[PDB]
Design a protein around this ligand. Sequence first.
Ligand SMILES: O=C(NCCCOCCCNC(=O)NS(=O)(=O)c1cccc(Cl)c1)NS(=O)(=O)c1cccc(Cl)c1
Ligand SMILES: O=C(NCCCOCCCNC(=O)NS(=O)(=O)c1cccc(Cl)c1)NS(=O)(=O)c1cccc(Cl)c1
Lengths: 317, 318, 317, 319
Amino acid sequence: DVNTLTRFVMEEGRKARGTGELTQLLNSLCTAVKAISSAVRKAGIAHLYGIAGKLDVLSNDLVMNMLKSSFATCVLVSEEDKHAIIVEPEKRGKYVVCFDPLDGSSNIDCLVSVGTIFGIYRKKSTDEPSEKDALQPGRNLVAAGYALYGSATMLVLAMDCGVNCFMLDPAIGEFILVDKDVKIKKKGKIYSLNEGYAKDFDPAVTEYIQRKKFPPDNSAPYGARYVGSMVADVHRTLVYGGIFLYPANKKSPNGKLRLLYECNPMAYVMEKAGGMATTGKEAVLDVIPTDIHQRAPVILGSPDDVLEFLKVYEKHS
Amino acid sequence: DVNTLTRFVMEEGRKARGTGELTQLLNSLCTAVKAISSAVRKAGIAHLYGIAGKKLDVLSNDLVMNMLKSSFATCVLVSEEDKHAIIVEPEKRGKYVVCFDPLDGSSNIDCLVSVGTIFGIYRKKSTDEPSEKDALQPGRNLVAAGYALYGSATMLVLAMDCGVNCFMLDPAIGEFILVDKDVKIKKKGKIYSLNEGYAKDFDPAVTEYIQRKKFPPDNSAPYGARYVGSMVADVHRTLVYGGIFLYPANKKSPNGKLRLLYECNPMAYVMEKAGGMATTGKEAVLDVIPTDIHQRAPVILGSPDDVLEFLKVYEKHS
Amino acid sequence: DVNTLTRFVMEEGRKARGTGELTQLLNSLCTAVKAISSAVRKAGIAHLYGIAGKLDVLSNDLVMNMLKSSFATCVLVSEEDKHAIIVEPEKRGKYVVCFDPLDGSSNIDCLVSVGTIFGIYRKKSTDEPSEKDALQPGRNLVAAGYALYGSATMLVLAMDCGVNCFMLDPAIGEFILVDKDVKIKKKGKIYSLNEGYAKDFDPAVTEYIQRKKFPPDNSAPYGARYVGSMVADVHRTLVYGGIFLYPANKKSPNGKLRLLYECNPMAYVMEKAGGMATTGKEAVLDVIPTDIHQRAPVILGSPDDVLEFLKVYEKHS
Amino acid sequence: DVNTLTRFVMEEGRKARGTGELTQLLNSLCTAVKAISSAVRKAGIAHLYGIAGVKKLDVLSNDLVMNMLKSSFATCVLVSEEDKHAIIVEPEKRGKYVVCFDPLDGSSNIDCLVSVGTIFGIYRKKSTDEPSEKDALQPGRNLVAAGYALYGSATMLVLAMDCGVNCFMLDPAIGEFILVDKDVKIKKKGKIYSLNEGYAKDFDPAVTEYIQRKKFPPDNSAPYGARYVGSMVADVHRTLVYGGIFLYPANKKSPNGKLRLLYECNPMAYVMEKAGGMATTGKEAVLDVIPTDIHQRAPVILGSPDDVLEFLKVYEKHS
Ligand SMILES: O=C(NCCCOCCCNC(=O)NS(=O)(=O)c1cccc(Cl)c1)NS(=O)(=O)c1cccc(Cl)c1
Ligand SMILES: O=C(NCCCOCCCNC(=O)NS(=O)(=O)c1cccc(Cl)c1)NS(=O)(=O)c1cccc(Cl)c1
């Protein structure tokens, strides 16, 4: 039977005997994602160019506004906003959402794939909502995932039931379930990181990547791919297997990607698909945050590959 | 004033006193590209999954083939998807030869990587009966070339004698809107792009060149690295931001991997019309004289300062 | 604050402490309407004409399949099907749906407005579901409405809480609430019927139309509009006021429109909007059907206008 | 073989050995029509209702047609239903054609989602004088091309030229007008009549008798059906496809009718005649009226030729 995101979350909710509030959140989020997709594919650009005589800000406003009006959220953390946004009392629900509304957009002038990353927590205390409600370890996530605006638009939704992938049919504005309960390969053949900054690599990263290009045995060297857009690179990692690295170094001892709305959601998707996500010292999902914009190193992907990285990493520690 | 692809080529043709045949070709191609874009973004995918109770690269080929045949502007069509050249039936024969890659990069489309359509347009040069040999022209002979990139948005980049112009597809109205006129690439960039997974097979010149990007001998900042693995995406980034793109020969591909007629030549032509460069290492891509419609070529292309720097390293290794 | 059909029905259901089954039905119905709208506006028609080298049937297939897979329905009556469709046991829910999947399509070759009409009943008996479960008076409706595929696509949904109008935004595939708790004008200035059958009119209709052209109280004559597509004519009646008539004639002594899936849904929308709908002898919603395809005369619209017709009708007994 | 509006006009132009200027006009017009269609179907309406935290359609449509036509380099004088005076195209963008158009005909009732449309008629500038409003004061006989876009259940462009009438369906997935009906001809006699009978008390006696004949046929034939959308493009297009008659006639309160000659009556009369139909004011062919004011009204009775002739017989009978 055909299945849409709307029908899927309703049915997972009836199984869980839920009240429907998380489904309202996700419905509102999907509406925002269709609106972002439409703007990212440049619907209406002819009007900007005078036929009748910003993008990351618009994406942020869409997500912010749909979530606030969902009546399901109370604290909203965005990559685009210095402080957490506190939902006004009359619209407050029980969930905390951290999101990157248009990840990768700094290079959107070249039409690179971009995406929306999100992580959904249940508010844990009864105190007045504040930034501290978003300072939960990724282990506490209720749901997380991303929309990828690539050759097509796809929503990847990870929850306790696993990882499910929904293709946006723009003819009708429906997310169609096309990949159910997806699992990542145990071991891949692609490595993904910015090798231009090799001079700053931690010595363990240098050795691990050397082994991918120059295997000490008779295996074939890994292929290299690096889009420079986290959603594109992580989704390829999910589909094809392999490893994605944005690691710490001496100049950036905490990495550069942001824990709350980049690393944790991707780490959660990965673990629900049978993959791994490490900072090098611990699981990303076990980091207890102290700053809503704090950075974390991340190495994620096929478990055999992540474990091999950790072997080399331990060797230099 | 607002300008569309349709209006633009018609006006360039009136300037040149043309008969309208190349405009008919380009109109037909743009119709195919909009249909390809629609299918690549998965419009109607719900019907495949049973809402009411062809593979993309095949459909893309059919769209380009059929639109070009019915344009009455072409006589020989070479496609990545077809082993032999397609000879247009006599009643629909026009004067142009088109080599194209209908959905470049589609082998990884299952991860939604950017994909694209690449095309190069020649005038048929011989008076012989149309045949595969009509497509064996060096890229220097191109009349027009370019690509559609199906990325975060769909864009058509069209290079001609007048320069390079970029048109954004507005899917609300099915129009390509002129958004970047007479585009020129930066003289020098800060990004290098190649599959470093083949580092073990690199010839010494490539190895040294890449070492210079990571460990600059003048202690300037290292280049950043980007490699989508989809040629249209990487070349378009190279055009927009500058830098250098490399697909050199390796042990799996001793004659390079990218295809001369419908990947390297069209991108080389766009690059040169934008003030960039494109070389095999031994000569300009556009100067290679093809002998086989699917033959491969090594390619190094992008900002002129960067390609020239590579060629100095190449000369150093003779 | 912005509101979608998805969010609206979900929020009405949470207010009512519902189990979500009617929402699943209405969500499935909205998906089908968007796919019908896409096909009616001829998205993809270029493929039929060979770019790469039925409409009422498709609409019926879209509604049947989405409702079956909603797990909310048990009996389905369609204009297109001789007998009621009984949902297979594993997909059975508690609701009965009568619908006209593409009303007006007989004239779609001239691109007349067309529409989808639906009425939703709860199954009342514990017996195995059967065609007889749809033989309920319109008084028993739980929800009803229509999608109009006109200059734009609009879904009008009537329930106990009133009538709400949602515009389909085709850029994002969302029904946006644009008219809340709609009420029809007490009296309009437009009458709508096929005057081509004047030779067959009952004397009461003849006299009423005479009053519209030659007003006895010195008011201006009514304008006449008759699209010939019931959804288009009824929606204008809702928006501008006035009266719509499809009375009996010699070709159709019981009228021409079908009680279960044309007259009843429109009568229910009208009454929920403060309007009226009568056969001449009784309220449409009070007719107790004995055949799922039975016909009924219908006079509906602004209450002052219908009452004036009934005043003339009673004069002729 | 598939044929699009753009491909069709290029090929008609190469046949005529034309310079392409009219094709540029028609291309620009098609771009505006696709943009009108998008706005009419309410693409983006969610932004008006606060999804992220504004011209009326008839204003937007006029702006779209005006701007696309000016930038076509193919026009010199532009007459719009929306503008009191003709627009004179600036010298650097002047071409040889005069365009009269109604950018969103029927829009006054668009709040009920009635079918609406865009109507256009294209003239060659005949004089060597400086371009002025007078260049639009040509009889419909002089039309080079005319037609309409109907935004109904689907969007269709009907284009009438010397070669006949052709119908192109807009495929909104790709923004292409696809040729679906070639060389269209109207039925010789129809079975539908179309006019606002609510104003019957003001009818001219010939109209009263003709409509009486449609409802109470004197020869035991079947009475005609009645249809009246109230949007001219929708009613005229149904008339083209199914046959019959459409009436917006003069009366004593409105001796010149209500519809506008230059950008409503003339283009529809031209489409009808190119399809083998008729269009009359009652006293003469619409296309033969010589206008003196760009916004002047004309009565119009059009459609299947036997039906129109029957009307004219009734009209002549009442002198
Ligand atoms: O999804 C969840 N539950 C499923 C839905 C059940 O609750 C629906 C509440 C609204 N009620 C109705 O609509 N009722 S009605 O009869 O249809 C009705 C009555 C009157 C008017 C109308 Cl129009 C309709 N729970 S969850 O916590 O969000 C959740 C948990 C786990 C995973 C996930 Cl993904 C989500
Ligand atoms: O584009 C080129 N020329 C532009 C104008 C071509 O005009 C030919 C079109 C056919 N003629 C008309 O349509 N005539 S009409 O009066 O409008 C007419 C008459 C009757 C019915 C109608 Cl409906 C319309 N030349 S080129 O070689 O292709 C070329 C060269 C260089 C760069 C490029 Cl990009 C392209």
